[PDB]
Design a protein around this ligand. Sequence first.
Ligand SMILES: Nc1nc2c(ncn2[C@@H]2O[C@H](COP(=O)(O)OP(=O)(O)OP(=O)(O)O)[C@@H](O)[C@H]2O)c(=O)[nH]1
Ligand SMILES: [Mg+2]
Lengths: 81, 171, 87, 934
Amino acid sequence: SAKAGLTFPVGRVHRLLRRGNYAQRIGSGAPVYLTAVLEYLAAEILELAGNAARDNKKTRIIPRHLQLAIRNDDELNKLLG
Amino acid sequence: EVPTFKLVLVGDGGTGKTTFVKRHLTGEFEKKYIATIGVEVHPLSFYTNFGEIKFDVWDTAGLEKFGGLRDGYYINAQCAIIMFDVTSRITYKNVPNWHRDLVRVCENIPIVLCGNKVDVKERKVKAKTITFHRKKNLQYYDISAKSNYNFEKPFLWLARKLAGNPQLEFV
Amino acid sequence: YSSYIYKVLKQTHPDTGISQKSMSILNSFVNDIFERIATEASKLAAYNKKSTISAREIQTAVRLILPGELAKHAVSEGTRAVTKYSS
Amino acid sequence: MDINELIIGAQSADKHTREVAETQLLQWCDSDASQVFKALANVALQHEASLESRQFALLSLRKLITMYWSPGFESYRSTSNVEIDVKDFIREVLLKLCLNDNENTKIKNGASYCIVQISAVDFPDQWPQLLTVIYDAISHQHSLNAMSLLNEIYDDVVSEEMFFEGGIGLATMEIVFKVLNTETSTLIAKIAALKLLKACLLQMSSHNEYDEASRKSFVSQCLATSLQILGQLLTLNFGNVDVISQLKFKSIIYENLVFIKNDFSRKHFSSELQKQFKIMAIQDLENVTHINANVETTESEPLLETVHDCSIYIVEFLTSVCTLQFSVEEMNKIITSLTILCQLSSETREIWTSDFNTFVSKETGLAASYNVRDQANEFFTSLPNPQLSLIFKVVSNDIEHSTCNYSTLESLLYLLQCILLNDDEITGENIDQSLQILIKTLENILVSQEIPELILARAILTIPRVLDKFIDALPDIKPLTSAFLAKSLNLALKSDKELIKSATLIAFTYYCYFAELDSVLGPEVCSETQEKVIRIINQVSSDAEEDTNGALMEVLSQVISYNPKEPHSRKEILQAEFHLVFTISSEDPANVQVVVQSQECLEKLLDNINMDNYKNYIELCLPSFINVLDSNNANNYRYSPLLSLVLEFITVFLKKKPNDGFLPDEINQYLFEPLAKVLAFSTEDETLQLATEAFSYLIFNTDTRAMEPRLMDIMKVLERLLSLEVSDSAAMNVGPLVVAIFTRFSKEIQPLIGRILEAVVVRLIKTQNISTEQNLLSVLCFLTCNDPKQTVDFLSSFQIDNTDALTLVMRKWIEAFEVIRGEKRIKENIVALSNLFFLNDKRLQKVVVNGNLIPYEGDLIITRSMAKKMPDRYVQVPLYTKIIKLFVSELSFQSVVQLLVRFFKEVASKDVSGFHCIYETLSDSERKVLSEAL
Ligand SMILES: Nc1nc2c(ncn2[C@@H]2O[C@H](COP(=O)(O)OP(=O)(O)OP(=O)(O)O)[C@@H](O)[C@H]2O)c(=O)[nH]1
Ligand SMILES: [Mg+2]
């Protein structure tokens, strides 16, 4: 994570994916890619929650604003069920 | 003057309540899943004999994270519909909780239990696992949303019970 | 998975309010995605008969799971991340 | 702000007023929640307020308890904390509201709900006064409201830890026993007391041999004490005062008794105690039956219902202890009592006679009702062999002496039916003599013309059960079966009542289960039986229902299985059978039970199709199969399980055929026009997916010359299938169809090649789904492998919007190359790419692609919110270089390897398009990987 300022670490995700034993060997780009995609989708939700908070006219964040944001986003609804 | 009856629709989230009321309202089966939040009131009218029957369907959110003040919507309910998915046994397991809450808020309104999503090829719960309803003098009706299998039947039964007219049919 | 989410939080949004249950449920959603993505990735790997999970597997997995504009945004940032990390 | 004004507006039907009121209260309660809670409890406490207003306050309070009461709740919020003083004030109000008898039951239920939610965390340590107040009311005042409150607490918040280790379990059992022992207590309180005992037994029911001496000793001590008290309660008699409460008192007692027997080890429930409990349990049936004499006055409707409800538990207890020995004296008591209880009520008899559809649902078991008659079935089914012989002896004897009593004959016949459903064989000293008498009177029932319809229907249904159970005892079964079945069918034909006709059809199903009608009846007799049954089916089908149709298919399936062989096949019955299965099924297409059962019927009838009789089946089936297409045409081809089934079963008709060659043009002439209209004018994808593959097989199994005039017609389908009108979920199905049409009509497709290429490229460039575009690109690469030069020329000539189409199609191809997963599709894609590289046309050299991505600056994650002002950038590289990088990257990742290295070797043989310089521009790892193959 400290190579080029990446946020999420590689060891934790690597051991989490190794505990499932989904494959015999892990590719070199798989950990960095998954850290990248995961953090991106997390932000997609945090920023949505934030705008819902701004929509609430309150800088604070509570799960009600998150629920409003997820319900508003139809594609996010389909992705998250 | 057309009599009106308040109807509350409850069930586990993801069971197909809003799609059912939308199909009854228009006649088009909705595909993508949009989780209902809060409560939406959809007036319903049925062209029958012996007068006209008007329903005020109170669709309720099936997820506890969206059902804010959910128990406060059955205050003046006269008839309720508890519908559960037959593709998942969890909805049937949750049905007794729905019935208990409905009975607690309002004592002895007529309740009809509907098994939705019967058009699917396989059902994890069959007609032999409905032990709850047979001991509570409830009425079990098998309906589907993709098809029109018995889609007007529960409303017909509720109207018959409410109007006290066993010889009432829809047209 | 705490300092990372708090730091992305403080960089994307300067002014915000925070409670523990918020990123508690956030952790939950991301964990669900990681498990889901582990499912699809593993299944396609078995389907293509490769004992090693590599880039093409997760490109395929992300593409099939996430639809729409966020899908191409995701693959774009993943690609720039791997090139900025391969060198 | 006013709380009273807020609640009245919070229950308004209008969305806007309800939303603002709801969000105002929650926002107001978010800050200084103590103010709202005190005001909310005040509204409920006020007597002058409306009942609806008060009920909403308590129900709203319960939800707010999970939010602001105290930490430990999943939905708890730390924004505002209720003060301890306010918390105690609510507790006093809730207890006062849930205990006084002057309050409405609606308020008490709401108050109890709030108390349960509060008790989810505070009970029992943080709220010691709750149990002490409740216990005082029950012990000294027998407060039903307090006792009912304890039941709710036990159901939701009491677990094993506070039951056994905590003092809740021991204290409650002592209090419950005290109430039961005290004869001065009112009867109505005892019903509530035993309901509390049932909740207590639930905690002990999870024993499964606890590994704890304290738990085991406590459980055993209470169970023995409760059993002695329960037995003591039954002996006491109340008289004729409050008969309704007496039945409820007995009903709950026996419900506990079956719980002890069926949810505990045999050591706790002594075998001798079962004999003691079996005595008055039988006697209670006599008492319940003699109560019906007073119920005959019809003083109250629930009085008759309560008799049946109470008797169900009594019969249920006898089922649990059915393994015990039954004396001959008590043998008659059960049978005599059960005959009265199993008697059909006037309302039920009126309903069945008026509407035979309801009878079919109940008889076939699909009905959702459950009465004492069904419970009596369980008791007789679970009986063991030694008692079953005595069971059959008395019942058969009782039937003989009750031949002239039509009032109670139906119950005895139904009881006999339940006995014969038992799995154990019935062997006895004088069964042979009894069996001869039983069939003799059963035969006379059919002969007599004054028998009521209900008795006749039961006799018809119960006749096969007698034969099936005694298949070996009877030495002349074969002549008897033919005589009875023929007699039953003749009665159904002559009778004008649908109840009898439906009963005979169900009876015919029972005949086929136990005996093979072909062997016993013979070849010619079985054919006559099939002709008789379908005539009965035709008359019944006029007035069928949702459940009648399902059973009508079941009997029809049996008739199909009894069809004669090919040398003795009869065309008349086959025509009637096929017209019948379609007629009933089309009446209720949405019925999934009918559709799946009709599928089995269709499979059996089509299982014996040969080349010799193929022509007959074509005219027998195809006109009927067209009819449903015309019937569903008026509906614009919406979803229908029948429509899905017929299209699926259309295919197997094409599949089932002699393997000499393509099918005759008669099938093509009949099916093509309705099938083409199905593919167009329809938007649903599930029916479209079934239609295209059915359509594809017809095209792939028809003569080229015969299909020549309609090559233009299918182009409209091809354009419509690839048009934006249909969903992308049905887009991928065009692949097999286009492959089949190219295989069959590779000659004359050249004029339409441009049109089909334009349609496919438009659909590919307009679609966003990965699977749809993948299948479209696979189709496109198939066409490219067919003729790359023509496709390249058309793509260069064709224009999309304002740009050359070939540019976008190539960009999409290279973009999706890295994402294709189909190994066969990978081979097609890789081979097609190699072929186009070989072509080395100058058109691709001029155009450029954007495969490589140039990273941006700022280290900021870009999402859809700012994508418009912060868009992605890609550098421009030639397609040849890009694909070369693609293969070298794939080899770095690395079956297709052999073909790809063969392509590399072929490239090295001519190094066209400046392969040397491009290879020089490659990276060190790429160069090493390429040299590994070379
Ligand atoms: N195939 C099929 N889908 C059904 C049927 N009934 C419901 N659905 C689907 O179930 C979903 C219903 O979503 P909604 O209309 O929000 O109803 P709901 O799931 O009760 O709503 P929540 O309780 O808010 O989750 C849609 O995807 C429907 O197409 C049915 O009989 N057949
Ligand atoms: Mg919904």
